[PDB]
A paper describes a structure:
As the virus buds from the cell, the viral protease cleaves [name] into several fragments, including the capsid protein (CA) that then assembles into the mature capsid shell (core), rendering the virus particle infectious. The CA portion of all retroviral [name] proteins folds into two separate domains, the N-terminal domain (CANTD) and C-terminal domain (CACTD). In mature lattices, CANTD interactions form only intra-hexamer and intra-pentamer interfaces, while CACTD interactions are also involved in formation of inter-hexamer and inter-pentamer interfaces. Our results show that, like lentiviruses, [name] is sensitive to [name] in vitro and in cells, where in the mature CA lattice [name] binds in a pore formed in the center of the CANTD hexamer.
For further analysis, we rigid-body fitted individual CA domains into the EM density maps of hexamer/pentamer unit pairs. These structures and models indeed confirmed that the mature polyhedron CA lattice consists of structurally different, intrinsically flexible CA hexamers that strongly deviate from regular sixfold symmetry. The hexamers that are adjacent to pentamers are deformed to allow bridging of the tube-like areas and the pentamer vertices. Further analysis of the different hexamers forming the mature CA lattice in polyhedral CLPs revealed that despite the deformability of the CA hexamer, local symmetries exist in the lattice. Aside from the C2-symmetric hexamers that are also observed in regular tubes (and are surrounded by only hexamers, Fig. 3b group V), a fraction of hexamers in the polyhedrons were surrounded by either two or three pentamers in a symmetrical manner and hence followed C2 symmetry and C3 symmetry, respectively. As the structure of the tube-like hexamer with C2 symmetry was already solved at high resolution from regular tubes, it was not further characterized. In contrast, the structures of the other two-symmetric hexamers highlight the structurally dominant influence of the pentamer, where it actively defines the conformation of its adjacent hexamers. Specifically, the two CA monomers facing a pentamer adopt an arrangement similar to those two CA monomers in the pentamer, causing an increased spatial separation between the CANTD’s of the hexamer.
Numbering used by the authors:
A (entry chain C), B (entry chain B), C (entry chain D), D (entry chain E), E (entry chain A), F (entry chain F): 11 to 148, 152 to 229
Write the structure that this text describes.
C-alpha cells in the first residue's frame, strides 16, 4: 500500500473549499485522484479530509447505500469481478467497507486480502456517492441558451444538469435531444429543424450544429 | 539508514503550524511521512521538530504507554513479528525505544539490530500516540441552531462536537439524531416531527431537511 | 495494469482548460500522455476527465468511426498486428472498445486479454479522433492587415489561421506567400513587389519587410 | 531517444512569452535546454512549441543557412566530427535536417543513424539561428540624456542601443565614449571635459561621473 | 572535490535568516549539510555565506579553540585518526585550518593531502563551534504564568527556556516539574498540589491540568 | 560542462532587481551561485543576465583590472595554482578571459583546457569585481549605534561598511575596534572600557559584549 500525497490532498481540499462540491473542475479533480483503485482506507480518509463533517456524514450514508446496491447485484450474479465461482468467495459488506476480519484499521492487510474487482467496485460506488452528496448539499427543464452564450457551453451545462438528476438512465438521451430542439434559441432551433438527415443522438446533433453554425 | 528530507520535514512542520494537529490534512501528511517503517531515531527527531515542547512531552508519554501495551501483547503471544521463537529474541522496551545496547544515539547500529516487525510496531505505536496527543491538546449538549444560522452549518458544528468528544463510537448516531430533533429551532423541529417516513440516520435527516426546508 | 498519475491528468486537464483543444502545446501534451499503449479503460477515462461533456460525445463518435475503419482494414488484411493467422483471432469491435466478455469495467482483465497490436491500434485511433474533434470544436482567405495593425501581428494571425486549417501540408507556404502579397495593405504590397531579390519563403518575406518597413 | 519534459518546455514557453526572445534570462534558459545534444526532431519540435508562427519560419530559414555554412566547412575539411575519413561518410543536409532515409518523422531511427558530432553541430547551428532570429524579431545616435533623467539610466539605455545595433564589435567602445561626451547634458559634458585624467573606457567614465556628480 | 549546491546553501541561509541560529530545525538542517566530511574550504565558505559578519567572527574564534583542543588531544594520543604512527604524520593546525603548504586557497590540493580522519575531526569541531556561537549570540527561573495567560502558552514558554539553556540534559525534567509547581499562579498550583495521583513527568502534569482546568 | 539552472538565474535576477546590488542577501545569493568554480563563459553570461547594461560595462572593466592584478601576482610567483613550473604553462589574460585559442565562444573546449586554479582565480576575481561595482553604482565613519538598535546589527553594519571600503586590508581590524569603542552608545562604551581583559580583536569584543550586555 502506498498513500496518496498530502500535497495533492491539500490542493484538492482547497479546491473543494473555494470552488465548492459541484463545480466541473472539482469533479474533474476528484476523478483525477480517483484514477487508481483505492482501498476503503484511502477513500475514507480522503473524504474525511476534503469534506466537512455534515457532508461527510451524508457521504457515508450514500456510500453505504450504493455498496448495498452493488452487493444486491453481486448476489444476483455469481460472476461479479468481486465474487468468485464458489460460495466461499462471496463478498460481504464487511469486506467492502473494510470492516471484515484482518482489515479494521490496517491498510496493509486491507490491500492484502482485497480483490482488484473489489477495489474498482468500491471506487465506483464512492464516486457515485460523492456525486449524490454534491448534488444534495448546496434544474434541467429550466435551462435556456442565453442570447450571448455559445452552443458548446449550453450543451455542457444541459448535459451536466440532465445526467446529474433524478431521471432514469434510459431517459437521458431523448430528454437531451428534445431540450436541444426546444431550447437553444430559435436560430439553432431552425438549424436543427431543417436537418436533411435525422439526428438521433446528442453527439450527432452537437456535431451538426458545430459544422453549420453561424460564425459570429 | 537514510534520513528523511529536511524539505519534507519543514513543509510538514509548517502544515502543523498553520492547520494544527487535528486537521485531516495534517493527519494525512503524517500518514504520508509515516509510510516506510521508521527507526526510533527518525520518529523521535521528527516529533521533536514538528511538535512544540509541551506536545512533545505529551507525545513521549503516550508513545511509551502504547509501546508498553505492545510489549504486554508480545509477552502474551510468542509469535509477535518483533519476537522470535526462542526466549533469546524477546524484545525489551530498551530495544523498542532505541535505548538498548549499541543503539543509543547511533541510527546506523539501530537499523542494523532492529527487526522489520519491530520497526512497523514502533511506527504504529507512534502513529496512535500522535492521534491521542492531537485529540488531547486543543460541548455537544450546549449546541443550538442560531436564529439566523443555516442548517448545514449547524449540522457540521454538531457532528464535529459529537464525534470529537468522549462518547463511545456506538452512541454517536443516536445522540446526533436526538440533537437534531430537540435543537434545530422549532421550524425544523416540526419539519422533522411531521416526517411521513421514519428517519433512522443523520444523513437521511439532513437530506430530508435540505429537500423540504423553507427557502429564505 | 498501472493507472496514469492523477497529477499528470490534472495538469493536462488544466492545460486543455486554458490553452484549448487545438493549441500545439496541448497536442504535444496529449502525445506525451499517449506514449505508452493505453487500454480502452485508460483512454476512455482520460477523455472523460480532460474533455467536457459535448466534446466527449463528439470524441466517442469519432473514436468509434476510426475504430470501424481500422476493423475494415483488418478484415481486408489477415496480417494485422491485432489479428492472428487463424480465423479464431479475428478482432471484433467489442474487443477494441473494451466491450467484449471479461473486459467490461475491469481494466485488469482488459490488460490480460488484449494484444499489444490491439493496444497500439486503439491508441492511434483515439489520437486521430482527438485531432478530428479538436479541429471540429473550434478563415484564412478573409484575413486582412488592418490600417493600424503592425506587420508581425498580421503575419502571426495569418500563419496561425493557415496552419490551423484544412489545407494539405504542402500547400501552406505558397498560400502564406500569396496572402502576404495580396493582403498586407498597399504600402507593404508595393514594398514586396519592388523586391530586387526573389523571396521564396514566408520567413524571407518577413525579414525583408521588417528591414525595409516604414518606421511609424 | 528520450523526449524532453513537457513541464520544462511549458515553463520555457511561458518564459519566452513574458520576457521575450532577447532577454538574457531567456537565452540562459535556452542554453540550459540546449545542454545535451538534441536530435533534429527535438530541436524542431522545441522551436515549434516555444516560438510563434512567424518567428518559427524565420528560425527555419536561419537554421538552414547556418547548416549550409556548416556543410560548406565540412566539404572544406574531411576531418569534421560529423564526417568520416572515406567519402562514404560525407554528411548531406538531408541527414542534418533529419530528411534523410530512415529518419523522416522517426526519432528512434534518427538517434540510431546520427553521429554525436552531427548532433553537436546541429545543436550549435540551431543555437546560432535562435540568436539571429531573436536579434531580428525585436537608434543609438538619437539618444539624449533627458533633463530629469539620472546618468546610470542614460548609460544603460545608450550601451543597450549601441551593443544591440549593426556596428562592428571593435567600434562600440569609442562610439559609447564619444556619445557620453557629446550627449549627457552640458553639466556632465563639462564634468567629463575637465577630467584631470584621461578616460579611455566607458566603465572609467561612468565611475568618474558617479564619483563627482552633482547630488540632486 | 565537489562543491555543495548553492541552492541548498541559499535555502539554508534563508532558514537561518527566518528561524534564527538556535532553532532545532536550523540545527537539523546544519546537521544535514554537515553529513559528508567537508574540507576546510567548504565549511569556511558555508559559514561565510549563512552567518552574518559578527557571528562569523565569533564562529572563527570558537572553531579555532575547538581545533586547538583537538590538537591537544592528538598530541596526547598518537593513535588519532588524523595522526599517523611515526612523528612525520603529526597534524599541525595549519593543516587543519587549511593554512598548510599546498592548501591555501586551493580546494583540490586540500582534498588531495587531507586525511578522512582529519576531515571528520574538522567537521565535528566546526559543528561544536556552531553550537557554541548559536548559544552565545541571541531566563528560566524568571518565568511566571501571567494572570491572563493560558497554561499551554506558559508550558511552551517554560519548556523552551529550560531546554534552550545551560542545564545538563538529566536536570531538565525535574526543573520543569518543580517550575510547574511553584510558578503557574496559585489556582493551578493548588490544582497540581491536590493530585490524587503522583505526577512524575511534565507531559503527565500538562495532561492532568488540561483535563481539570477551570474553563474560563 | 554543465550550465547553471535558468530557474536559479531568474530568481537571482529578480533578487537583484528588487533588493539591489548591495544588499547582504544579494551578496549571499551571489556567493551561493559562486560556489563551484565557474568557467569564464558561465560568469560572463551570469553577469550579462543579472546586471543591467551600464553595471555590466562597469563589471567588465573591474573584472579586467582584477584579472590583471592576478596576472601580475602570477608573473611575480611561478608557483601560482594557475601557472605551471616551466615557462610553457604561464597563463595569459587571453586564457583567463576566455579569449585564447580553442576557447572563444565554446564552453566545452573552455572546460577542457582550463585548470582548476585558473577557475578559482577567475571566480574570486569576478566576485571582487562584483563587490566593487556594487559599491560604486548606487560611509564607515558616519555609523552610529541607534538608541533602539541591538549590538549585533550595529556590528554587522559597521563591519560591512568597513570591509567594503577603500581602506587597506591591514587597517580594517584597528578601525573596527576603535569604532566599537567610540560609537556604540555610552552604555556599551563603558562596558568595553571597563574590560578587565584587553580585547585585541573585533570577534573578542563582540563575544565580551554579548556575554555582559544588559538584557532588555
Amino acid at each position: 500500500w502506498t498513500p496518496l500525497e498530502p500535497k495533492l490532498i491539500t490542493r484538492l481540499a482547497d479546491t473543494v473549499r473555494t470552488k465548492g462540491l459541484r463545480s466541473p473542475i472539482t469533479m474533474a479533480e476528484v476523478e483525477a485522484l480517483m484514477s487508481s483503485p483505492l482501498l476503503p482506507h484511502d477513500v475514507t480518509n480522503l473524504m474525511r479530509v476534503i469534506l466537512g463533517p455534515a457532508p461527510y456524514a451524508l457521504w457515508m450514508d450514500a456510500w453505504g447505500v450504493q455498496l448495498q446496491t452493488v452487493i444486491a447485484a453481486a448476489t444476483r450474479d455469481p460472476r461479479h469481478p468481486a465474487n468468485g465461482q464458489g460460495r466461499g468467495e462471496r463478498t460481504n459488506l464487511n469486506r467492502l467497507k473494510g470492516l471484515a476480519d484482518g482489515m479494521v484499521g490496517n491498510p496493509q492487510g486491507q490491500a492484502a486480502l482485497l480483490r482488484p474487482g473489489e477495489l474498482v467496485a468500491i471506487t465506483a460506488s464512492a464516486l457515485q456517492a460523492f456525486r449524490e452528496v454534491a448534488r444534495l448539499a448546496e434544474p434541467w427543464a429550466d435551462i435556456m441558451q442565453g442570447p450571448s452564450e455559445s452552443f458548446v457551453d449550453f450543451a455542457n451545462r444541459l448535459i451536466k444538469a440532465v445526467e446529474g438528476s433524478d431521471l432514469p438512465p434510459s431517459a437521458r438521451a431523448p430528454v437531451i435531444i428534445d431540450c436541444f430542439r426546444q431550447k437553444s434559441q430559435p436560430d439553432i432551433q431552425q438549424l436543427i429543424r431543417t436537418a436533411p438527415s435525422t439526428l438521433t443522438t446528442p453527439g450527432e446533433i452537437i456535431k451538426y450544429v458545430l459544422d453549420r453554425q453561424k460564425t459570429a
